[PDB]
Amino acid sequence: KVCYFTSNGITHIDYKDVELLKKFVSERGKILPRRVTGTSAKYQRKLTVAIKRSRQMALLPFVA
Amino acid sequence: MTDPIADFLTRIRNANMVKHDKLELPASKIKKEIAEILKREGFIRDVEYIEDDNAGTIRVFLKYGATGERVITGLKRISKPGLRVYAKSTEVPKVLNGLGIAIVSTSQGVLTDKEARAKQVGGEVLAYVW
Amino acid sequence: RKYEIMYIIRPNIEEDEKKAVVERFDGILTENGAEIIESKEWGKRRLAYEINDYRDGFYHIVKLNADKADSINEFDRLAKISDDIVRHMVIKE
Amino acid sequence: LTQERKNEIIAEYRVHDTDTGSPEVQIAVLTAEINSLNEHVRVHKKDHHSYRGLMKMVGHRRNLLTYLRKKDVQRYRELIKRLGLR
Amino acid sequence: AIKKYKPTTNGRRHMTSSDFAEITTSTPEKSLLRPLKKKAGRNNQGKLTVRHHGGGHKRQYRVIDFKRNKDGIPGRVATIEYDPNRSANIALINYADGEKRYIIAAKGLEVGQTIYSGAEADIKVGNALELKDIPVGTVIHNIEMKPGKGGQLVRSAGTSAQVLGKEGKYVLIRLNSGEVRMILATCRATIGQVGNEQHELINIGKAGRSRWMGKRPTVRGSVMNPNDHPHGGGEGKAPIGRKSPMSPWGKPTLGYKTRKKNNNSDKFIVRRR
RNA sequence: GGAGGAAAAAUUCU
RNA sequence: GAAGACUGGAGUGCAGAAGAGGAGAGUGGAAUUCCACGUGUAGCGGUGAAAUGCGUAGAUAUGUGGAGGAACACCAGUGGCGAAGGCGACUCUCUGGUCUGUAACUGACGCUGAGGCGCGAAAGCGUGGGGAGCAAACAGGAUUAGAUACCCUGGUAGUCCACGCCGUAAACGAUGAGUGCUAAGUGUUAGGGGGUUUCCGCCCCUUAGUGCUGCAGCUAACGCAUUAAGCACUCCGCCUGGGGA
Ligand SMILES: [Mg+2]
Ligand SMILES: [Mg+2]
Ligand SMILES: [Mg+2]
Ligand SMILES: [Mg+2]
Ligand SMILES: [Mg+2]
Ligand SMILES: [Mg+2]
Ligand SMILES: [Mg+2]
Ligand SMILES: [Mg+2]
Ligand SMILES: [Mg+2]
Ligand SMILES: [Mg+2]
Ligand SMILES: [Mg+2]
Ligand SMILES: [Mg+2]
Ligand SMILES: [Mg+2]
Ligand SMILES: [Mg+2]
Ligand SMILES: [Mg+2]
Ligand SMILES: [Mg+2]
Ligand SMILES: [Mg+2]
Ligand SMILES: [Mg+2]
Ligand SMILES: [Mg+2]
Ligand SMILES: [Mg+2]
Ligand SMILES: [Mg+2]
CA distance E190 to E123: 9
Considering only the C-alpha atoms of chain B, give the largest distance between any 2 of them, rounded to a whole number of Å.
43
Q: Which nucleotide is nearest to B24 (CA to C1')?
A: G181
> Looking at the CA of E247, which ligand is closest?
7
Question: Does E141 appear as a known binding residue?
Answer: no
Burial of E179-210, coded b for 16+ CB within 10 Å and e otherwise, reads ebbbbbbebbbbbbbbbbeebeeeeebbeeee
To the nearest whole Å, the CA of C17 is away from the closest chain A CA by: 23
CA distance B77 to C38: 76
Residue type, E136: V
Q: What is the 3-state secondary structure (H, E, C) of chain E?
A: CEEECCCCCHHHCCCEEECCCCCCCCCCCHHHEEECCCCCCECCCCCECCCCCCCCCCCEEECECCCCCCCCCCEEEEEEECCCCCCCCEEEEEECCCCEEEEECECCCCCCCEECECCCCCCCCCCEEEHHHCCCCCEEECCCCCCCCCCCCCCCCCCCEEEEEECCCEEEEECCCCCEEEEECCCEEEECCECCHHHHHCECCCHHHHHHCCCCCCCCHHHCCCCCCCCCCCCCCCCCCCCCCEEECEEECCCCCCCCCCCHHHHHEEECC
Asked if residue E222 lies in contact with residue E175, where contact means CB atoms within 8 angstroms, the answer is no
Report, in ranges, which bases of strand G sit under 7 Å from a protein C-beta: 7-8, 10-15, 18-24, 26-30, 66-68, 73-77, 79, 82-84, 89-97, 104-106, 108-110, 118-120, 127-130, 163-164, 178-183, 188-191, 199-202, 216-217, 230-235
Mutate to test the interface with C, among A15, A57, A60 (most CBs of C within 10 A): A57
E176-CA/G132-C1' distance, Å = 22
Please name the residues in contact with E141: beta carbons below 8 A apart, sequence gap of 6 or more: E104, E106, E154, E155, E159, E160, E161, E189, E190, E191, E192, E193, E194
C-E contacts at Cβ under 8 angstroms:
3
- Protein residue closest to G24, using CA and C1': D44
Question: Does E83 appear as a known binding residue?
Answer: yes
Phi, psi at residue B38, to the nearest 5°? -60, -35
